[PDB]
Short mmCIF file of C-alpha atoms and ligand atoms in Angstrom, two decimals:
data_model
loop_
_atom_site.label_atom_id
_atom_site.label_comp_id
_atom_site.label_asym_id
_atom_site.label_seq_id
_atom_site.Cartn_x
_atom_site.Cartn_y
_atom_site.Cartn_z
CA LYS A 1 -0.02 -0.06 -0.04
CA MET A 2 3.76 1.34 0.83
CA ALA A 3 6.33 3.41 -1.38
CA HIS A 4 9.12 2.62 -3.60
CA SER A 5 12.85 3.72 -3.08
CA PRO A 6 13.95 6.11 -5.90
CA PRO A 7 14.83 4.28 -9.16
CA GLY A 8 18.07 2.62 -9.22
CA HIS A 9 18.26 3.06 -5.36
CA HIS A 10 17.34 0.73 -2.33
CA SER A 11 16.96 3.38 0.27
CA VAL A 12 16.73 7.11 1.05
CA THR A 13 19.56 8.68 3.34
CA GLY A 14 17.95 11.72 5.00
CA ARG A 15 20.89 13.98 6.09
CA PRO A 16 20.14 17.12 8.22
CA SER A 17 21.68 19.95 6.82
CA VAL A 18 21.03 22.85 9.39
CA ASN A 19 21.91 21.23 12.76
CA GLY A 20 25.36 20.16 12.53
CA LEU A 21 25.12 17.81 15.23
CA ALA A 22 22.25 15.89 14.00
CA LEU A 23 23.17 12.58 12.51
CA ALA A 24 21.49 11.03 9.52
CA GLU A 25 18.17 9.00 9.34
CA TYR A 26 17.60 6.32 6.78
CA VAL A 27 14.40 4.79 5.06
CA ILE A 28 14.05 1.40 3.48
CA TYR A 29 10.73 0.42 1.56
CA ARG A 30 11.29 -3.35 1.88
CA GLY A 31 11.07 -4.75 5.53
CA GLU A 32 13.37 -7.62 4.27
CA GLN A 33 16.11 -5.14 4.34
CA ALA A 34 16.42 -4.97 8.39
CA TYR A 35 16.76 -7.59 10.92
CA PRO A 36 16.32 -6.35 14.62
CA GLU A 37 19.30 -7.57 16.10
CA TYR A 38 19.31 -6.48 19.59
CA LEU A 39 16.22 -5.61 21.97
CA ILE A 40 17.51 -2.81 24.58
CA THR A 41 15.30 -2.11 27.84
CA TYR A 42 16.25 1.43 29.26
CA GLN A 43 15.14 4.40 30.92
CA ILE A 44 15.98 7.96 30.31
CA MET A 45 17.49 9.75 33.18
CA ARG A 46 16.35 13.23 34.50
CA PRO A 47 19.45 15.49 34.33
CA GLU A 48 21.24 16.82 37.41
CA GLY B 1 10.49 -18.66 16.26
CA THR B 2 12.17 -15.68 18.08
CA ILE B 3 14.30 -16.38 20.90
CA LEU B 4 15.64 -13.46 23.17
CA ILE B 5 19.26 -14.13 25.05
CA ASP B 6 20.31 -11.95 27.68
CA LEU B 7 23.78 -10.30 27.30
CA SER B 8 25.86 -9.98 30.46
CA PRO B 9 26.92 -6.23 31.50
CA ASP B 10 30.58 -7.76 31.77
CA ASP B 11 30.46 -8.77 28.06
CA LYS B 12 32.19 -6.50 25.49
CA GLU B 13 29.11 -7.06 23.14
CA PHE B 14 26.78 -5.35 25.90
CA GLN B 15 29.13 -2.60 26.49
CA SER B 16 29.62 -1.78 22.78
CA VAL B 17 26.02 -1.58 22.27
CA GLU B 18 25.45 0.53 25.55
CA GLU B 19 28.07 2.92 24.37
CA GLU B 20 26.55 3.31 20.76
CA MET B 21 23.13 3.96 22.77
CA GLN B 22 24.74 6.79 25.08
CA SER B 23 27.22 8.43 22.64
CA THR B 24 24.45 9.29 20.07
CA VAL B 25 22.19 11.02 22.43
CA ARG B 26 21.66 14.71 21.28
CA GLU B 27 19.63 17.68 22.03
CA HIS B 28 16.26 18.09 19.66
CA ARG B 29 14.77 21.00 18.20
CA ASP B 30 11.36 20.14 20.12
CA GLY B 31 13.24 20.87 23.60
CA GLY B 32 12.22 17.45 24.61
CA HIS B 33 8.69 17.52 23.63
CA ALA B 34 8.52 14.16 21.91
CA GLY B 35 10.95 11.88 23.60
CA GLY B 36 11.68 13.66 26.95
CA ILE B 37 14.53 15.77 28.79
CA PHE B 38 17.49 13.62 28.79
CA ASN B 39 21.29 13.54 28.27
CA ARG B 40 21.94 9.87 28.96
CA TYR B 41 20.04 6.43 29.67
CA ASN B 42 19.89 3.74 32.19
CA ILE B 43 20.56 0.64 30.22
CA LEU B 44 18.57 -2.08 32.25
CA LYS B 45 18.84 -4.85 29.54
CA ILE B 46 20.11 -5.85 26.26
CA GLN B 47 19.09 -9.02 24.48
CA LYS B 48 20.23 -10.50 21.31
CA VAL B 49 17.41 -11.59 19.10
CA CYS B 50 17.25 -14.83 17.21
CA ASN B 51 15.00 -15.85 14.65
CA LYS B 52 16.35 -18.28 11.91
CA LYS B 53 13.38 -17.91 9.32
CA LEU B 54 13.78 -13.82 9.63
CA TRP B 55 17.42 -14.04 9.44
CA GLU B 56 17.50 -16.14 6.07
CA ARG B 57 14.84 -13.74 5.01
CA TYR B 58 17.07 -10.85 5.64
CA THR B 59 20.18 -12.33 3.99
CA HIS B 60 18.31 -13.37 0.94
CA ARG B 61 17.20 -9.97 0.40
CA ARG B 62 20.68 -8.75 1.26
CA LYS B 63 22.32 -10.74 -1.58
CA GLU B 64 19.74 -9.37 -4.04
CA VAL B 65 20.74 -5.88 -2.98
CA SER B 66 24.31 -6.51 -2.64
CA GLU B 67 24.28 -7.93 -6.38
CA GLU B 68 22.34 -5.09 -7.65
CA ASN B 69 24.77 -2.68 -6.12
CA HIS B 70 27.63 -4.17 -7.63
CA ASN B 71 28.87 -6.44 -4.44
CA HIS B 72 27.91 -3.89 -2.18
CA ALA B 73 25.51 -4.22 0.75
CA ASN B 74 26.19 -0.93 2.35
CA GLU B 75 25.13 -2.63 5.54
CA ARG B 76 24.57 -0.44 8.73
CA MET B 77 23.65 -0.70 12.35
CA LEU B 78 20.92 1.72 13.18
CA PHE B 79 18.23 2.36 15.96
CA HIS B 80 14.45 2.02 15.71
CA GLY B 81 11.82 2.77 18.09
CA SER B 82 8.23 1.75 17.74
CA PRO B 83 4.85 0.63 19.65
CA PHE B 84 4.96 -2.13 17.36
CA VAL B 85 8.52 -3.39 18.72
CA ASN B 86 7.16 -6.66 20.24
CA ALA B 87 5.46 -7.52 16.83
CA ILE B 88 8.81 -6.66 14.81
CA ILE B 89 10.90 -9.16 16.78
CA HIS B 90 8.50 -11.99 16.38
CA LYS B 91 7.14 -11.46 12.62
CA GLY B 92 9.66 -9.11 11.21
CA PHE B 93 9.57 -5.53 9.88
CA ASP B 94 6.81 -4.96 7.22
CA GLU B 95 4.44 -2.34 5.70
CA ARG B 96 2.58 -2.10 8.88
CA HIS B 97 5.78 -0.86 10.47
CA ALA B 98 6.33 1.86 7.80
CA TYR B 99 5.73 5.91 8.19
CA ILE B 100 3.28 7.10 5.74
CA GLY B 101 3.67 10.85 6.85
CA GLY B 102 7.52 10.55 6.99
CA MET B 103 9.58 13.36 5.09
CA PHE B 104 11.26 10.89 2.72
CA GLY B 105 8.06 8.74 1.77
CA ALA B 106 6.02 5.97 3.05
CA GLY B 107 8.96 3.53 4.24
CA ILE B 108 10.54 2.33 7.38
CA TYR B 109 12.83 4.69 9.22
CA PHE B 110 15.98 4.23 11.23
CA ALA B 111 18.35 6.53 12.96
CA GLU B 112 22.22 6.90 13.89
CA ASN B 113 20.92 9.17 16.89
CA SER B 114 19.58 6.73 19.48
CA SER B 115 17.72 9.85 20.76
CA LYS B 116 15.88 10.37 17.70
CA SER B 117 14.45 6.85 17.61
CA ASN B 118 13.52 7.30 21.35
CA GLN B 119 11.24 9.90 19.99
CA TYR B 120 9.00 7.21 18.34
CA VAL B 121 9.04 4.63 21.09
CA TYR B 122 5.55 5.75 22.15
CA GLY B 123 4.44 6.70 18.71
CA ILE B 124 4.88 9.41 16.24
CA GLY B 125 5.90 12.56 17.96
CA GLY B 126 6.06 10.62 21.27
CA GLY B 127 2.23 9.92 21.35
CA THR B 128 0.70 10.49 24.55
CA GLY B 129 3.94 9.14 26.27
CA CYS B 130 4.17 5.97 28.80
CA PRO B 131 0.90 3.95 29.01
CA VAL B 132 0.99 4.33 32.84
CA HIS B 133 1.59 8.28 33.19
CA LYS B 134 0.92 9.49 29.78
CA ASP B 135 4.07 11.17 30.21
CA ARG B 136 6.35 11.84 27.10
CA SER B 137 9.25 12.50 29.42
CA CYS B 138 8.57 9.59 31.91
CA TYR B 139 11.59 8.53 34.09
CA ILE B 140 10.14 5.67 35.58
CA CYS B 141 8.46 3.40 33.02
CA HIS B 142 10.72 1.07 31.23
CA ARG B 143 11.30 1.84 27.32
CA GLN B 144 12.55 -0.49 24.37
CA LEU B 145 14.57 0.47 21.46
CA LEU B 146 15.75 -2.18 18.87
CA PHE B 147 19.37 -2.00 17.08
CA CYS B 148 19.27 -3.43 13.71
CA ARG B 149 21.20 -4.60 11.00
CA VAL B 150 19.93 -2.60 7.95
CA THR B 151 20.87 -3.11 4.12
CA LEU B 152 20.97 0.33 2.26
CA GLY B 153 22.40 -0.90 -0.90
CA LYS B 154 22.69 2.34 -3.48
CA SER B 155 21.14 4.95 -0.96
CA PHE B 156 19.57 8.32 -2.56
CA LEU B 157 21.09 11.23 -0.63
CA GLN B 158 18.57 13.67 0.37
CA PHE B 159 19.63 17.04 2.18
CA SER B 160 16.95 17.81 4.77
CA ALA B 161 16.11 21.05 6.12
C1 LIG C 1 5.65 3.72 14.55
C2 LIG C 1 6.12 4.20 13.21
C3 LIG C 1 5.17 5.00 12.45
C4 LIG C 1 7.26 4.99 13.08
C5 LIG C 1 8.55 4.44 13.89
C6 LIG C 1 9.94 4.90 13.68
N1 LIG C 1 11.03 4.72 14.58
C7 LIG C 1 12.17 5.38 14.25
O1 LIG C 1 12.98 5.12 15.23
C8 LIG C 1 12.40 6.48 13.55
C9 LIG C 1 13.63 7.23 13.28
N2 LIG C 1 14.58 7.85 13.14
C10 LIG C 1 11.38 6.78 12.84
C11 LIG C 1 10.33 6.16 12.89
C12 LIG C 1 8.87 6.79 12.08
O2 LIG C 1 7.90 5.43 11.86
ZN1 LIG C 2 5.56 6.38 32.96
#
């Protein structure tokens, strides 16, 4: 029901161009292109 | 078919994953609205996710992509947060886990910043926060993230504002 990657491409790299400390985000359009290797359980911590 | 195996905190593998979590926290432009206010995590558990069927599904696709991209899978480890994490580890990623309103089209999104993926643990925009307290910055409730092997292949570079 879901989109297609650009022709000739298998994914999109979304690279922030304004925030210089922000790292990249990535999009795939086939679920078979990801495998959930680790499950991490955590809390966020309140700054002191 | 999925088995979860606990890693020991004394294990180099545990410590490596924790460091990738902690070292890729950043500040966000929403001031903490979606994912909460924090500079670091308390890591409670790290488990290896094992499913033979799903792994072979992944490697089969990886081989297709690698060969199409002239023998380069362009494989990364990336974070993913989602209300559907429990379904993902048992059934695998599919269209149900995609983001229709995403900046880059209706696909499945992954982050290098752990804190970016943390913004999606309780849904798009953080949803209404944790179930128990309805608090997007809850410091009590336990959260989960996936750290995933992802095949990028030939990746289209989109600069984002
Ligand atoms: C629940 C779905 C709609 C959501 C999950 C999700 N998880 C992430 O870690 C990221 C990132 N980066 C983006 C999205 C967008 O899609
Ligand atoms: Zn809570």
